[PDB]
Each structure stands twice: as structure tokens, then as C-alpha cells.
From Swiss-Prot, chain A:
Protein name: 26S proteasome regulatory subunit 6A
Annotated source species: Saccharomyces cerevisiae (strain ATCC 204508 / S288c) (Baker's yeast)
Covered residues, full protein: 41 to 85 of 434
Biological role stated in the UniProt entry: The 26S proteasome is involved in the ATP-dependent degradation of ubiquitinated proteins. The regulatory (or ATPase) complex confers ATP dependency and substrate specificity to the 26S complex.
Family affiliation: Belongs to the AAA ATPase family.
Compartment(s): Cytoplasm; Nucleus
Domain of life: Eukaryota
Curated annotation (Swiss-Prot), chain B:
GO terms of biological process kind: positive regulation of protein catabolic process; positive regulation of RNA polymerase II transcription preinitiation complex assembly; proteasome regulatory particle assembly; proteasome-mediated ubiquitin-dependent protein catabolic process; ubiquitin-dependent protein catabolic process
Family to which the UniProt record says this protein belongs: Belongs to the AAA ATPase family.
Assigned keywords, A-Z: ATP-binding, Cytoplasm, Nucleotide-binding, Nucleus, Phosphoprotein, Proteasome
Name of the protein: 26S proteasome regulatory subunit 7 homolog
PTM characteristics: The N-terminus is blocked.
Residues bearing the modification Phosphoserine: S52, S119
Subcellular location: Cytoplasm; Nucleus
Parts of the chain that traverse the membrane: none
Predominant location category: cytoplasm
GO cellular component terms listed in the entry, alphabetical order: cytoplasm; nucleus; proteasome complex; proteasome regulatory particle, base subcomplex
Extra facts: Present with 105 molecules/cell in log phase SD medium.
Covered range of the whole protein: 77 to 234 of 467
Lineage start: Eukaryota, Fungi, Dikarya, Ascomycota, Saccharomycotina
Organism: Saccharomyces cerevisiae (strain ATCC 204508 / S288c) (Baker's yeast)
GO molecular function annotations of the record: ATP binding; ATP hydrolysis activity; proteasome-activating activity; ubiquitin protein ligase binding
Role this protein plays: The 26S proteasome is involved in the ATP-dependent degradation of ubiquitinated proteins. The regulatory (or ATPase) complex confers ATP dependency and substrate specificity to the 26S complex.
Amino acid sequence: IRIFRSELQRLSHENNVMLEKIKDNKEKIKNNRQLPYLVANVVEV
Amino acid sequence: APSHLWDIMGDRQRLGEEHPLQVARCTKIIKKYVINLKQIAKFVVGLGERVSPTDIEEGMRVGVDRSKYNIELPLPPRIDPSVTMMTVEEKPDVTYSDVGGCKDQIEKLREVVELPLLSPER
């Protein structure tokens, strides 16, 4: 009984560790986004 | 003679890159600024260091740097026409006393033109 509840409890902990990597990637995206870009016309999707 | 005094201050205003700005008219204001160049090129920029947020208005020529586009100084709009610059004269030779006669073609003009300009509170 305690084994099934221990895996689900550690699942939220492992998600928080990977969430810090996602937040660090978003900071890299925000650093990669700087106001001076250019505008283009979409041809085909 | 005047060229010698201007060469002293010409170190910061020439060697450094400030003046080489690309002037273009701003279109959309998001408070991201969409500005179309003279070469028909659209881009996105934002405010500067000393640039005030209330100075940028819709449909105004805004100079930006050619390398990394950023707002630097605003400029008065409608810079294209060169014709109306010569239409304004200065100090006409004909004076107010050159018009002869006591008739009504004088007093009627000064009351609807000169009167509201000189005494708007009347």
C-alpha cells in the first residue's frame, strides 16, 4: 500500500526538478528574444 | 576660423556611432513597435535610454540605428515635401499705411483678422 503511494509522491518531486529545467529554458528563450527582429510575409503553411 | 572650434568637439560626434540613424515612420504602438523603412522593410523595436514613452506617436518619423534597430530620437512628421518651405515669406515691403482711401475695404479686414490675433479676449 505504501509502495503505490510512494511512487506517486515522488512523481511530483521529479516533475518539479524537470520544471526547473523548463524554467531555465524559458529564460534562455527570453534571452534569445530581443526587440529588434524583422517582419516577413507568410507564403504557405 | 569657426572650423577650428568645431574640430575639438568633433571627436565624440564623429568617431563614435550616434548620428548614423535610419529614419522611418512608425505604424503600430504596443504598450513592440512596427516601423516601415524607406526601403519597404518592417521590423519591431522598443524605447531607448533617454527616450520618453510619451514622445512616440502614431505616424511619426523615428530614427533608429542601422546595425541594431532601436529608437533614439524623434523627428517631426511630414519630412518629404520640400515645396512649402519656400512658400513662407518674411517681412513684406508693403506696409499697413500703403493702402489708400478711407473706405470700408480696410476696417472690415482688420476686425476679422488682426483683431482676434492682437486682442483675442475682446
